[PDB]
Amino acid sequence: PRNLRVLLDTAIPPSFCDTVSSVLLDDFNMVSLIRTSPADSLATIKQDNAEIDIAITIDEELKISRFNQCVLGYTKAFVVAHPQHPLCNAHSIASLANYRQISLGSRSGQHSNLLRPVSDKVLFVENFDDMLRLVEAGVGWGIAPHYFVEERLRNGTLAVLSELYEPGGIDTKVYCYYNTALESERSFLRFLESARQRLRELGRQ
Amino acid sequence: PRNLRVLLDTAIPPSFCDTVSSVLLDDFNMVSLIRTSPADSLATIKQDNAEIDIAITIDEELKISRFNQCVLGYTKAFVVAHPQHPLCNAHSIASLANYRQISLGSRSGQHSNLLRPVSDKVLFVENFDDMLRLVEAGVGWGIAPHYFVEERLRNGTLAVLSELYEPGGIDTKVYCYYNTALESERSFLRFLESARQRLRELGRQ
Ligand SMILES: Fc1ccc(C#CCNc2ccnc(C(F)(F)F)c2)cc1
Ligand SMILES: Fc1ccc(C#CCNc2ccnc(C(F)(F)F)c2)cc1
């Protein structure tokens, strides 16, 4: 035993996990890293069989039995669309409720408040890569993490629709859920401090 | 006609409203300022009779007919309790679900995710003053805005319980809901820029 299993959703930057990997490797037998869609994180850890000890995700649930919650920091996500998508005036949310958007589907078909689509023209996809395939094809708009659309936004391939809603990008809170057996661990607090400093650093890029 | 009615919940600092008062006074016949509990803001504007044109509140609702939503910035709120309240070790949320807290009741008895109490020992109050009466009396803990508990926290009269949950204070997003008739107003955009800069300034204090 003593095998730590950590879950990160694909809204967390890959660079972030470096800290996870460096800090708590030494304090456990074996550290395992798993990535899921933000829409599958909570449902994944709520499978007892899955034996997830730590989850780092933007999804929010009030009380998930046998898990505590704490905040690690913030990330950025933008509403993006094809640069010639009808809505590129930025009215903003008013219009979005009526056009197609590629939003992250879930294996359970249900969604939280944070991630439930806003429109009724909705096309579910499993991952951000498919989302942005369809979005770069004019099929609809979509909400995606910063690090996914950085390249494309500065290359004209994509346009931001959410500067009136929240200038600078939709700041999304990043939560850490974890086993009630870890509060009594020195490691875990070292990890929390390091992860918080790390998100704080990534925010400055 | 042309009487602007603006609503602010008591989680927004009073100083903030100064900008509101200065910026849009000149562009309307008459500007009226109304303050409500964060738990009464949305329900208040959803009364058609109330004729609210702008609401500035931390409460969140996905879609409220005849109103658009946008983000103005962030404020801070802390979980506070009597300095000798049992829980002053800061376990954190784990324990809070089982002790009494004075949380903001609503006139409708229903609550959003953001504001629905966490415990089952719950004592509803109408306003933050009553909340902190009972909290300074050891009766329970409570979530209150920064500017309410600043004085008391630096004077030992109060203690913070939520530094492990989110060090620095629970950052709460501040929304602005407004009439679909105001998107077509120059005033409103001036107000948005000014209000956003204002919350950004207040964050630095
Ligand atoms: F017009 C809109 C549409 C959506 C939002 C929002 C929000 C909450 N934040 C997220 C949601 C969905 N997805 C992500 C992320 F996975 F990309 F991070 C982050 C704001 C204005
Ligand atoms: F253990 C806890 C308990 C509650 C929270 C939270 C939250 C959301 N933010 C607010 C909620 C209720 N009230 C306010 C305010 F009105 F004071 F701003 C702000 C975090 C950890």
The DSSP-derived string for chain A is --EEEEEEETTS-HHHHHHHHHHHTTTSSEEEEEEE-TTTHHHHHTSGGG---EEEES---S--TTEEEEEEEEEEEEEEE-TTSTTTT--THHHHTTS-EEEE--TTS---TTTS-S-SSEEEESSHHHHHHHHHTTS-BEEEEHHHHHHHHHTTS-EE--TTTSTT-EEEEEEEEEETTSTT-HHHHHHHHHHHHHHHHHTT-
Cα separation, A178 vs B164, whole angstroms: 13
Q: What is the CA radius of gyration of chain A?
A: 18
Task: Tell me, in angstroms, the distance from the centre of ligand 2 to residue A112's CA.
Answer: 19
Do the beta carbons of residue B112 and residue B59 sit within 8 Å? Answer: yes
Q: What is the DSSP letter of B113?
A: T
A171 interfaces chain B, CB cutoff of 8 Å? yes
Residue having the nearest C-alpha atom to atom 4 of ligand 2: B143
B10 lines ligand 2 (CB under 6 A): no
Cα separation, B89 vs B85, whole angstroms: 9
- Asked if the Cβ–Cβ distance from A69 to B173 is below 8 Å, we say no
Annotated domain spans of chain A:
1-205
Residue having the nearest C-alpha atom to atom 9 of ligand 2: B172
CB-defined site of ligand 1, < 6 Å: A 11, 38, 58, 77, 79, 93, 96, 114-115, 118, 143-145, 162, 165, 170, 172
Q: Any idea which residue has 């602010």 for tokens?
A: B8
Cα separation, B67 vs B54, whole angstroms: 9
Contacts of B190 (CB under 8 A, 6+ apart): B23, B24, B27
Cα separation, A178 vs A188, whole angstroms: 9
Do the beta carbons of residue B79 and residue B96 sit within 8 Å? Answer: yes
Q: How far is CA B71 from CA A18, A175, B57, B59, B181, in A?
A: 32, 20, 10, 11, 18
B170 lines ligand 2 (CB under 6 A): yes
Please report which helix (H) or strand (E) contains residue B74, including its range: strand B67-81
Cα separation, A138 vs A128, whole angstroms: 15
Q: Resolution to 1 decimal, in Å?
A: 2.3
Return the best residue to mutate from B143, B171, B172 for the ligand 2 pocket (most ligand atoms within 8 A of CB): B143
Query: Obtained via which technique?
Result: X-ray
Residue of B89, B163, B166 to mutate, interface with A, max A Cβ within 10 Å: B166
Cα of first residue to Cα of last residue in chain B, in angstroms, is: 39
Q: Any idea which residue has 């910026």 for tokens?
A: B23
Please report which helix (H) or strand (E) contains residue B21, including its range: helix B14-24
Q: Which residues on chain A are in Cβ contact (under 8 Å) with B180?
A: 94
Nearest chain B CA: its distance from A183 CA (Å):
7
Cα of first residue to Cα of last residue in chain A, in angstroms, is: 39
Q: What is the DSSP letter of B141?
A: B
What are the DSSP calls for B157-194, one per residue?
A: S-EE--TTTSTT-EEEEEEEEEETTSTT-HHHHHHHHH
Strands B3-9 and B30-36, bridge-based pairing: parallel
Please report which helix (H) or strand (E) contains residue B202, including its range: helix B186-202
Return the best residue to mutate from A92, A115, A143 for the ligand 1 pocket (most ligand atoms within 8 A of CB): A143
Token pair in block for residue B181: 């008739």
Collapsing DSSP states into helix, strand and coil, what is residue B85? coil
- Asked if the Cβ–Cβ distance from A63 to B97 is below 8 Å, we say yes
Q: What is the CA radius of gyration of chain B?
A: 18
Contacts of A26 (CB under 8 A, 6+ apart): none
B173 interfaces chain A, CB cutoff of 8 Å? yes
- Asked if the Cβ–Cβ distance from A70 to B171 is below 8 Å, we say no
Q: How far is CA B180 from CA A58, A95, A124, B26, B64, in A?
A: 30, 12, 29, 21, 11
B196 interfaces chain A, CB cutoff of 8 Å? yes
Max CA separation in chain B (angstroms): 56
Residue having the nearest C-alpha atom to atom 1 of ligand 2: B93
Token pair in block for residue A106: 């879930």
Token pair in block for residue A184: 């009594």
Angle (nearest 5°) at CA B62 between A127 and B13: 115
Q: How far is CA A96 from CA A76, A88, B82, in A?
A: 19, 11, 46
- Asked if the Cβ–Cβ distance from A94 to B68 is below 8 Å, we say yes
Q: Any idea which residue has 């992860």 for tokens?
A: A195
Token pair in block for residue A103: 């939003």
Token pair in block for residue A119: 């429109």
